Symmetry: C3
Subunit: 117 residues, 3 copies
């Protein structure tokens, strides 16, 4: 799959970015059984002040993980994976769980290409 | 929900960004009844020249609103919400309606986490 | 439709960006019959080092094409369009096919607005 991770520039050091990527990647491999190399984590950073919750401009602590998955997994599994990402990312980024949002989108495998194949 | 808003850097002043966020947030709360704090607006800015319509490189006026919603709302409602966003954002950003694109994506509530819960 | 294209800053020159946009746009028009002007290509660039495959930090060669489409097209067609994008983008960006990922997301036409309509 592909995990788009939206964070504020400078909030995560290159070291934290790696730890967050590993956390997400390990959770996915661990719970779905999909090979590690098949998981992409793409960080999209924006200047502080581009996030609004309830119309209020936030700091740089929000982290929105948008996971693009292959269809076919149970609701219970996706639920566990979503929670696992929250707990592990919170630890990896040393950021309070309340700052983490996670949304999973699905698509049939037939319209998904990874590594050009 | 989470509204990813793609704009060109500098096109929206911090003041306009707030107005655009409030517009979108008010429309969602107003039409769906979902609490204000449950609506996130995430602005993703890119340098002018990263947008192409029909293969032609555009200026910095395009605004693409990609709304990530919870499944379960009628087509009529989503239709009204989409239009409401077009009218209100056009007013908030003082930008002609023709520059506004709006796409809604849906996901079951079970694979959606907000505020770590 | 709207094609979000995630690349690393400076990897694509403005000339390559245009060629990549045309490639994608031509493939979509050619295979679906949807008018050229109805296809938006939105490049989202990030500094080198924001991409991780299998938890490993990559260079600036990855290109993730996330196509947001209107529902209703066959699996075979979406399959051909996905492949066509891989071949043509690889040529347009003079980048090896292994660096190209392509994911298609779908939504009913009723919750899709282009050019404010």
């Amino acid at each position: 799959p592909v995990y788009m991770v939206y964070v504020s520039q400078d909030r995560l050091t290159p070291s934290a970015k790696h730890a967050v990527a590993k956390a997400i990647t390990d959770a996915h491999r661990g719970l779905t059984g999909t090979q590690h190399f098949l998981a992409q984590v793409n960080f999209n950073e924006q200047p502080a002040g581009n996030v609004f919750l309830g119309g209020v401009q936030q700091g740089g602590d929000t982290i929105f993980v948008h996971g693009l998955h292959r269809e076919g997994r149970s609701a219970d599994l996706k639920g566990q994976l979503a929670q696992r990402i929250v707990d592990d990312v919170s630890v990896a980024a040393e950021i309070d769980r309340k700052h983490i949002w996670v949304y999973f989108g699905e698509m049939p495998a037939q319209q998904m290409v990874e590594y050009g194949r």
